[PDB]
Ligand binder design. Structure first.
Ligand SMILES: *[C@@H]1O[C@H](CO)[C@@H](O)[C@H](O)[C@H]1NC(C)=O
Ligand SMILES: *[C@@H]1O[C@H](CO)[C@@H](O)[C@H](O)[C@H]1NC(C)=O
Lengths: 351, 41, 103
């Protein structure tokens, strides 16, 4: 045998020892999954809910922009629907983490908006389209409105994008916890602590509390080091929540005023161009519920021992090799800590 | 489960982009994230 | 059974121009569209009661408009598809699934 220290005879062979080792692995994975399930489901629920809520806000804003174009500028439809749809599609794609340039969204929006304004509102009556698109930026027809919208929406969209990325990475690391493979030495120590008592013919004897403590603090030396970075992650997320619903909902007034602003100098513009051519409640409850799991990694070995059958009294217990009267006494973890450091820097820089 | 007891119902299946999650400007998952089918209950 | 003469071909919406779907079968008395699993409203259907030259039998041609708003607001699993069901004195017949997508 290579695990069960044979002091007397033994009721189990080497193959039974391998079976006990695999059952020890499975029991450890089950205990980790039971410890991490509540938090995993909490973050999954919140990620899904926030995603749907942000999509609802974006859909309502696109609907109101289309409706206000239908009502106030019927001469700009149906082209207005095209550039509004493209703008809010790129908005949603940026929120969901795609490589989209916010300044490019606003600039393409105004580039598409100006030619139809000129042809239908200012000078009623396809090839000259690009000359108008160039004149939009060359003559600064929209004033500071494009940069105002640019900053207004970039500030909110970046914090929302990083909030969702933080939720996703929390889901990732909490999923990773219950799949943590351990050392071979720890496999043998867990087999001794949980099952090797059966090889000596004992039926209901449990391992000593102190033996469980030494074994767990033995193989969780790396996992416990994650606690600092996990605490910093929780607190940085709290820093970030303390943005985007208000901004996207005021966009329509700003766009209407920008169209008015361009129409205000039509006299000179036409001649020159003719010559030239419950959310905040949810994130608050989420942070208040997430602060209840700040001890998750530090309380984890305590959980494994308090949910495994152990003799807390350290009397008439199994010490891994014999029944005693009193007890005598990187890589995946590195990746978890790397990603936590990255997300923590990214959080702290936002707020 | 089909939300409507009688007639046309709905069935949803989610597919998240988290295994692995994009980092430092990595390309995001390509295609649809939700799947919805009509069911007759 | 009803034999389809003009089966609907997969349409593509370009620059928000709503392109209707054609459907023609003989012998047919009722032709309806099943877009994405569910029946299309009676008002959307435009029926034509034609007579064929090759054979004196009742032909039916139905057109249904598909707007950009219908495709962009559809959040289903597969591509926005539509099917044609024709009714005869003997039974029914389904056509090709034309999937209208926002190119
Ligand atoms: C969609 O447009 C309608 C008509 O103006 C409006 O009543 C509704 O609030 C809008 N919905 C969304 C999602 O914007
Ligand atoms: C559908 O409506 C559009 C209007 O933009 C039109 O171009 C198309 O030919 C129509 N088909 C119908 C009315 O069946």
């Amino acid at each position: 045998l290579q695990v069960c220290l044979p002091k007397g005879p033994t009721c189990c062979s080497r193959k039974m020892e391998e079976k006990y080792q695999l059952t020890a692995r499975l029991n450890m994975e089950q205990l980790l999954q039971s410890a991490s399930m509540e938090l995993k489901f909490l973050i999954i629920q919140n990620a899904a809910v926030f995603q749907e809520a942000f999509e609802i806000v974006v859909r309502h804003a696109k609907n109101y922009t289309n409706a206000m174009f239908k009502n106030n500028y019927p001469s700009l439809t149906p082209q207005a629907f095209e550039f509004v749809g493209e703008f809010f599609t790129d908005v949603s794609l940026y929120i969901l983490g795609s490589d989209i340039n916010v300044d490019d969204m606003v600039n393409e929006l105004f580039d598409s908006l100006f030619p139809v304004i000129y042809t239908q509102m200012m000078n009623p009556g396809l090839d000259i389209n690009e000359c108008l698109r160039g004149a939009r930026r060359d003559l600064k027809v929209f004033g500071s409105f494009p940069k105002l919208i640019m900053t207004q929406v970039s500030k909110s969209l970046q914090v929302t994008r990083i909030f969702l990325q933080a939720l996703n990475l929390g889901i990732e690391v909490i999923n990773t916890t219950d799949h943590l493979k351990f050392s071979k030495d720890c496999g043998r120590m867990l087999t001794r602590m949980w099952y090797c008592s059966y090889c000596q013919g004992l039926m209901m004897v449990k391992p000593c509390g102190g033996y469980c403590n030494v074994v767990m603090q033995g193989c969780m030396a790396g996992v416990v080091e994650i606690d600092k970075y996990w605490r910093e992650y929780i607190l940085s997320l709290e820093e970030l929540v303390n943005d985007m619903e208000n901004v996207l909902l005021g966009l329509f007034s700003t766009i209407h005023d920008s169209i008015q602003y361009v129409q205000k100098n039509g006299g000179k513009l036409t001649t020159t161009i003719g010559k030239l051519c419950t959310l905040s409640s949810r994130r608050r409850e989420l942070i208040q519920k997430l602060k209840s799991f700040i001890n998750f990694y530090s309380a984890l070995p305590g959980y494994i021992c308090s949910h495994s059958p152990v003799a807390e009294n350290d009397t008439l217990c199994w010490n891994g090799q014999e029944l005693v009267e009193r007890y005598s006494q990187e890589p995946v973890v590195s990746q978890i800590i790397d990603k936590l450091k990255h997300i923590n820097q990214l959080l702290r820089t936002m707020s | 489960a089909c939300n409507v007891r009688c007639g046309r119902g709905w069935q949803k299946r989610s597919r998240t982009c988290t295994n692995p999650a994009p980092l430092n400007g990595g390309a995001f998952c390509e295609g649809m994230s939700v799947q919805k089918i009509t069911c007759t209950a | 059974l009803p034999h389809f003469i003009e089966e609907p071909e997969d349409a593509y919406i370009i620059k928000s121009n709503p392109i209707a779907l054609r459907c023609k079968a003989r012998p047919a008395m009722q032709i309806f569209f099943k877009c994405n699993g569910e029946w299309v409203h009676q008002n959307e259907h435009v029926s034509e009661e034609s007579l064929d030259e090759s054979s004196g039998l009742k032909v039916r041609e139905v057109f249904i408009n598909v707007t950009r708003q219908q495709v962009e607001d559809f959040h289903g699993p597969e591509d926005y598809w539509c099917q044609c069901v024709a009714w005869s004195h003997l039974g029914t017949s389904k056509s090709r699934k034309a999937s209208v997508r926002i190119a």
